[PDB]
Amino acid sequence: RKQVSDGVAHIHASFNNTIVTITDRQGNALGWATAGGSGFRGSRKSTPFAAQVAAERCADAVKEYGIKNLEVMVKGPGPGRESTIRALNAAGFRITNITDVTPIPHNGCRPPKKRRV
């Protein structure tokens, strides 16, 4: 609506789900989509296909704003890391740079006990 035409895409990748959001330079979100929110459900459907579907849905929702150039941030690992990137690039978007902003701790807090399976 505001026709800013410039924004940044935040991607949060997790072993169980992936989240894609679009915001402006001031951090104000405009639209978002998730793999679980795009018809898929369960970890057995957490493949990069669901991630790209969610990215396409987010792009369709945010197309009303007329964004053309996006700076994309990657948060954490996950199958839907590059799939979301290509999905949003294919939806008429001009990529600028890929920034990895995964929150790596400097051994501050003790990690939860690892699984025994």
Partner: peptide, 18 residues
């Protein structure tokens, strides 16, 4: 434990380097 994996990784010190 959060310490056993570190010891296991350090056990491989003598795998093929020395």
């Amino acid at each position: 434990f959060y310490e056993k994996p570190t010891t296991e990784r350090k056990r491989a010190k003598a795998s093929a380097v020395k």
